[PDB]
Amino acid sequence: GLVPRGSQILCVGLVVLDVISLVDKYPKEDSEIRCLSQRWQRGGNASNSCTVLSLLGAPCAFMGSMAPGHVADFLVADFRRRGVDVSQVAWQSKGDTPSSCCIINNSNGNRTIVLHDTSLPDVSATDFEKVDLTQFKWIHIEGRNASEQVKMLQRIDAHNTRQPPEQKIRVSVEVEKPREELFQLFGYGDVVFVSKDVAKHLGFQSAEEALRGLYGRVRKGAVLVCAWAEEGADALGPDGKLLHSDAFPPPRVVDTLGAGDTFNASVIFSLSQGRSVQEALRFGCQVAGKKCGLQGFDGIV
Amino acid sequence: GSQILCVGLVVLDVISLVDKYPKEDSEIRCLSQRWQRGGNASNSCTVLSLLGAPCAFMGSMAPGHVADFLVADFRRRGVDVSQVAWQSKGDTPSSCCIINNSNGNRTIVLHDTSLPDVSATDFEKVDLTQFKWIHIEGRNASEQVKMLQRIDAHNTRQPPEQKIRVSVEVEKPREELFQLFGYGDVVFVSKDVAKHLGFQSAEEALRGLYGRVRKGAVLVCAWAEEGADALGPDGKLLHSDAFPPPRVVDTLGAGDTFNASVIFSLSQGRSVQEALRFGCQVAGKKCGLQGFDGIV
Numbered sequence: 358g359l360v361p362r363g364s365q366i367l368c369v370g371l372v373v374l375d376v377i378s379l380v381d382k383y384p385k386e387d388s389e390i391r392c393l394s395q396r397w398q399r400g401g402n403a404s405n406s407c408t409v410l411s412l413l414g415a416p417c418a419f420m421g422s423m424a425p426g427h428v429a430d431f432l433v434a435d436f437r438r439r440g441v442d443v444s445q446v447a448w449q450s451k452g453d454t455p456s457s458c459c460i461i462n463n464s465n466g467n468r469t470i471v472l473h474d475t476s477l478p479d480v481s482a483t484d485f486e487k488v489d490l491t492q493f494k495w496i497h498i499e500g501r502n503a504s505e506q507v508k509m510l511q512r513i514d515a516h517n518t519r520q521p522p523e524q525k526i527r528v529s530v531e532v533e534k535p536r537e538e539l540f541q542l543f544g545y546g547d548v549v550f551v552s553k554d555v556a557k558h559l560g561f562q563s564a565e566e567a568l569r570g571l572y573g574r575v576r577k578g579a580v581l582v583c584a585w586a587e588e589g590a591d592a593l594g595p596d597g598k599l600l601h602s603d604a605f606p607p608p609r610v611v612d613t614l615g616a617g618d619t620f621n622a623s624v625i626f627s628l629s630q631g632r633s634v635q636e637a638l639r640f641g642c643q644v645a646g647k648k649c650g651l652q653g654f655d656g657i658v
Numbered sequence: 659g660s661q662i663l664c665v666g667l668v669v670l671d672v673i674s675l676v677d678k679y680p681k682e683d684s685e686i687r688c689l690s691q692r693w694q695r696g697g698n699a700s701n702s703c704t705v706l707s708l709l710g711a712p713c714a715f716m717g718s719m720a721p722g723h724v725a726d727f728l729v730a731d732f733r734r735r736g737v738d739v740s741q742v743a744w745q746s747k748g749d750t751p752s753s754c755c756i757i758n759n760s761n762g763n764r765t766i767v768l769h770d771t772s773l774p775d776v777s778a779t780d781f782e783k784v785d786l787t788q789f790k791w792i793h794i795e796g797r798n799a800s801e802q803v804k805m806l807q808r809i810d811a812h813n814t815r816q817p818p819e820q821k822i823r824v825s826v827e828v829e830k831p832r833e834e835l836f837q838l839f840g841y842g843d844v845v846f847v848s849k850d851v852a853k854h855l856g857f858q859s860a861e862e863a864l865r866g867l868y869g870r871v872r873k874g875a876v877l878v879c880a881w882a883e884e885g886a887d888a889l890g891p892d893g894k895l896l897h898s899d900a901f902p903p904p905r906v907v908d909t910l911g912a913g914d915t916f917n918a919s920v921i922f923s924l925s926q927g928r929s930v931q932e933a934l935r936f937g938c939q940v941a942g943k944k945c946g947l948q949g950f951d952g953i954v
């Protein structure tokens with residue numbers, strides 16, 4: 358259907374089918390066991406943020422790779438269940454739609470993960486070239502295949518050079534995996550999210566240290582954001598003022614999976630609504646905090 | 659009497675093929691992923707169909723996108739699904755299967771979905787005249803013993819040439835299922851059942867459990883790389899060496915490949931010694947391949 362010009366928030370990244378099995382004890386190799394419960398969930402960073410944006414009240418779209426089949430059909434119906442626009446999916450003739458097996462031990466609480474295979478090709482710069490960008494007001498990129506994503510980010514810069522400031526597409530980038538290839542993405546986007554895991558891997562012991570130590574890696578006028586679990590989150594802009602919000606923990610912590618993505622989508626949402634960086638930081642902490650005391654994404658708003 | 663019927667489960671096997679078995683609390687990437695129609699009686703139908711035997715499957719299924727995958731797979735193989743007990747309540751069962759590519763060890767984490775089992779009432783509706791052989795996968799024992807009494811009752815009212823041959827698989831070490839030992843012309847006892855009863859070899863298990871079988875029945879026990887053994891009314895132990903592939907890559911459904919191949923061979927009038935050997939042959943060929951294609 359007809360999407361009004363400059364109305365959508367696009368999230369580019371991974372979508373995976375996570376099969377989560379709760380077991381009494383970890384299975385020994387060569388055994389046939391019965392799980393206590395099993396859940397099929399749509400996962401992935403960009404995919405999780407999409408759900409959160411829909412629940413926040415934003416028209417939102419997902420861009421990612423899928424191969425036709427029964428897995429992709431489950432994932433699409435789940436995206437559609439969450440009001441996500443799936444028209445930009447980069448459908449692939451070769452490879453498997455990502456699927457992961459997670460085994461949770463009910464006794465000790467430990468998670469054993471069999472990650473999805475490498476077979477499916479990631480969204481390319483040539484796939485991104487074919488996209489009419491005018492229906493987007495904001496483009497969020499989950500850092501994966503960096504050399505290709507750098508070109509997509511250059512395409513958005515070119516688009517923006519030709520627009521009046523009120524028709525310029527805002528851009529955000531997430532560096533969540535501690536992979537060297539990804540670190541070149543700090544130099545792109547108006548908003549750069551760096552994970553606590555990446556910061557710790559780079560030798561930083563706090564969100565303050567990470568922001569001060571990495572701000573030199575960003576482009577002029579960019580805001581660098583770091584969430585540090587129960588320590589809340591910090592942001593640092595061109596003015597040199599380290600902004601901070603304390604976490605809003607739930608009465609009891611139930612499910613932190615995808616709380617990082619909830620933070621990211623809530624910060625993006627709040628900024629896209631004309632709120633300030635301090636306001637966006639606070640709101641992101643409030644929404645991610647509510648999420649941690651809930652199973653899944655129901656009732657985060 | 660031209661079709662073999664397999665009564666049991668149909669389960670969606672969500673497979674991950676790994677180069678090593680994951681250590682607890684670890685994170686490993688898999689080599690490849692695939693969906694496969696599973697369930698013991700379902701896997702035996704795949705094998706029977708590839709062997710050229712017209713066969714039928716009977717089991718519970720719940721309508722949905724997964725059952726649509728399962729049904730399309732059954733049809734692509736020529737398996738008759740007309741006998742399926744479609745349920746209004748319950749989800750289709752599924753399992754996560756980790757296959758170790760370096761030794762073929764398969765680990766199954768099954769999600770049993772409260773789907774109601776096939777009952778003696780469901781069985782009562784079946785036209786027994788189209789079946790040469792009926793194989794029953796041991797699940798709801800008390801309810802299956804009734805299904806078995808019905809075939810025996812049909813047999814009494816038939817000439818010896820028109821009798822329906824019956825096989826039973828006791829794969830899970832559950833005491834409820836030991837009453838099925840019990841019924842049938844051919845009884846398949848697993849290595850896991852046999853071990854759980856204190857036996858250390860196929861021959862030990864057969865000598866120890868023969869006392870439980872029906873007059874004139876053949877008790878069969880496969881023992882992985884040790885091949886398989888069989889024991890009949892004549893008291894003569896029969897053995898077959900395994901046919902291992904040089905590289906064992908996937909044992910998922912090897913047990914079902916063996917049961918189906920033994921059933922097919924016997925249904926074709928071959929001796930117990932030949933059927934045992936054929937079972938080991940097809941099961942061993944399977945262990946060198948991913949899935950069931952290419953076994954014959």
Ligand SMILES: C[C@]1(O)CCN(c2nc(N3C[C@H](O)[C@@H](O)C3)cc(C(F)(F)F)c2C#N)C1
Pocket residue numbers: 584585586587589604605606607610613616617620642645646647649
């Ligand atoms: C944006 C985020 O940094 C992503 C993670 N997240 C939180 N993570 C928490 N964890 C507890 C465990 O150590 C582990 O599961 C992670 C605890 C809290 C909470 F306590 F504040 F609720 C929050 C919040 N918000 C917020």
Ligand SMILES: C[C@]1(O)CCN(c2nc(N3C[C@H](O)[C@@H](O)C3)cc(C(F)(F)F)c2C#N)C1
Pocket residue numbers: 387761762763764880881882883900901902903906909912913914916938941942943945
């Ligand atoms: C009917 C069966 O008993 C069911 C299992 N099966 C086999 N299991 C094998 N393994 C099971 C475990 O993963 C480890 O012990 C290896 C190996 C072989 C093979 F090596 F002979 F190929 C066969 C054969 N056939 C035959």
